[PDB]
Every structure is written in structure tokens, then in C-alpha cells.
């Protein structure tokens with residue numbers, strides 16, 4: 284029973300030689316040697332039972348990832364848990380090991396246009412598939428984008444992922460949000476729950492901008508500051524953009540701000556490709572209805588060397604549609620049942 288960074292992993296004895304990769308609010312990720320397959324693997328310990336919200340996410344993550352099979356999305360190779368509900372303390376997810384993630388790469392390495400183009404291609408290919416299943420990732424960021432020696436890109440961390448619910452998206456001004464701040468679409472701050480596909484497109488734009496400069500484009504130090512970084516670049520939203528925001532608190536806040544002009548993409552990224560900046564402009568659109576969809580982003584002249592509709596698969600069976608009320612105990616039961624097949 285090895286330990287890492289204060290947590291105990293009950294992966295014995297099939298997986299050994301552990302090391303630590305990442306941490307989460309209710310989960311930890313570590314590398315391990317798998318004897319059966321004779322290769323290095325990623326193991327995700329998830330402790331969601333104490334809290335209810337964590338149980339919902341965990342069930343959603345396991346169900347989504349078991350559903351998916353895509354070259355650009357992390358899969359589940361195995362699920363380790365205790366044989367009984369009473370003995371089930373933690374849930375262990377075995378996934379393929381990736382060399383690193385885009386966050387780590389960006390901290391130390393300059394990316395060439397070729398790498399940028401190809402990374403964006405694989406993100407959009409993976410996202411096209413996620414979206415075709417009627418799934419929103421909701422937490423796209425460089426640390427959720429894994430890479431290997433040959434530059435293959437895989438999307439991971441589906442804990443915050445939900446089935447799309449456009450009808451129930453509207454909400455009040457300054458409504459709290461879980462997902463990473465720097466990659467939040469401006470609507471989240473003003474009138475959205477993050478229940479539409481356009482939410483992920485905005486995150487992809489932020490990543491593209493971070494690939495062009497090795498620095499986050501909108502590094503807001505707090506909830507409101509995030510919005511003011513966005514408007515600082517995008518300029519004051521148009522009359523037509525403001526008209527789509529009907530809740531008055533959000534509208535009156537935008538109207539009270541002094542007029543700021545749109546900073547040009549070329550001035551922010553002078554070394555960037557002109558086609559790359561044209562796509563970035565489309566992704567980073569203040570109005571979510573005017574924002575480019577994943578399939579149009581793939582069809583963009585910046586990705587014409589990789590664009591192939593036939594080689595961009597979509598989900599065979601999309602998710603159709605209530606864990607919000609279900610307590611930690613009933614959720615522990617569904618998690619146990621969803622992980623049964625791996626015993």
C-alpha cells in the first residue's frame with residue numbers, strides 16, 4: 284500500500300512503482316507500473332463520498348468516459364474499487380499515461396506555428412466528438428490537454444462535464460461558477476450557467492491565445508476582474524450584443540462602464556499567423572450566438588492542411604438527458620453499479 288503526497292492508493296498489487304502527477308479537490312492522479320500490460324499507467328484516486336456534489340460529478344465522469352472512444356479523448360482502461368459498498372472508500376480510475384500536458388509545456392517551451400496548428404486541430408477534433416454526444420466539457424485548459432513525445436493530444440478531466448441544456452442556461456448576474464476563471468466565457472459572469480456548446484469554444488480560443496504567447500490572455504485575479512480583462516481586449520460590446528442580455532443587473536453593469544476600444548489581435552500577437560488570428564477572433568466573440576461552432580472552426584483556412592470531415596468522427600450514441608437532489612448514499616450505489624463490470 285504505497286503513499287503519495289499524503290494519500291494512500293490501494294492499487295496493489297497489479298499496479299506498482301507509483302509517482303505523483305496531479306491533484307484535485309476530491310481526487311489525486313499518480314503514475315504506476317501495470318504488471319498485466321507491462322506498461323506505465325495513470326491512476327486517478329477519487330474520494331467523492333463525503334460530499335454530494337463530488338458524487339454527482341464522479342458518476343457523470345465515469346459514465347461519459349465509458350461512453351467515449353476517441354483517439355483525442357482520455358479513456359478508462361480499468362476501475363479498481365473494493366468488492367462491497369460498505370468497504371468502498373475510494374474509486375480508482377486506470378487510464379493511459381501521457382508524457383505531459385500543455386500547461387507544463389507552455390511554462391518552458393516556445394511553440395512553432397506547426398505545433399500550434401496541429402494542437403488546435405486535435406483539440407477541435409476531440410471537441411467535435413464531445414459536442415456530437417451532446418456533452419460539454421466545461422473545463423478546457425492547458426492542464427486538461429495531455430501530450431506525448433510525438434505530439435498527440437488527448438483531452439482529460441471530465442469531472443465538470445454535463446449533458447447540454449440550452450433551455451435552462453439563463454441565470455442572474457454574478458452567479459457563482461466552479462470551472463477555471465481564466466477560461467470562462469464572458470456570459471458566465473453575466474447571464475449563463477455554461478449549459479451551451481459555445482462555452483467550450485470560448486475556452487479553446489483562450490488556449491489558442493495562450494499557445495501564441497505562452498501567457499494566459501485573460502488572467503483575471505477575481506470573478507469581476509475576469510470580465511474587465513475580456514472587455515479590455517474585445518472592447519465595449521455592441522448595441523446588438525447588449526440586447527441579447529435581458530437581465531437588467533448584467534445590462535446596467537455593462538452600460539455603466541466607460542467605453543474601451545477593441546485591442547487588435549496583431550498588436551497582441553505580432554509573430555502570429557494571420558489565419559490563426561482570424562480563427563482566434565471568431566472563437567473569442569462576446570456574443571455566444573455569434574461565436575464559431577466546433578465544426579466551422581475545423582473548416583477554417585488556418586486548419587486546411589488537416590481538415591478532413593471523414594476523419595473527424597462523431598459519437599455513435601449521444602447522451603439524451605437528476606443527481607441534484609440524490610444524497611451521497613444513493614450516488615455511492617450508482618457509482619458502485621457503474622464500476623461493477625471491471626471487478
Ligand SMILES: COCCN1C(=O)c2cc(-c3nc(Nc4ccnn4C)ncc3C)[nH]c2C[C@@H]1C
Pocket residue numbers: 304305306307308309310311312325327357378379380381382383384387426427429439440441
Ligand atoms: C484529480 O483529477 C483532477 C483532474 N486531472 C485529471 O483528471 C488528470 C489526468 C491526467 C493524466 N496525466 C497524465 N500525464 C501527465 C500530465 C502532466 N504530467 N503528466 C505526467 N497522463 C494521463 C492522465 C490521465 N492529468 C490530469 C490533470 C488533473 C490532475
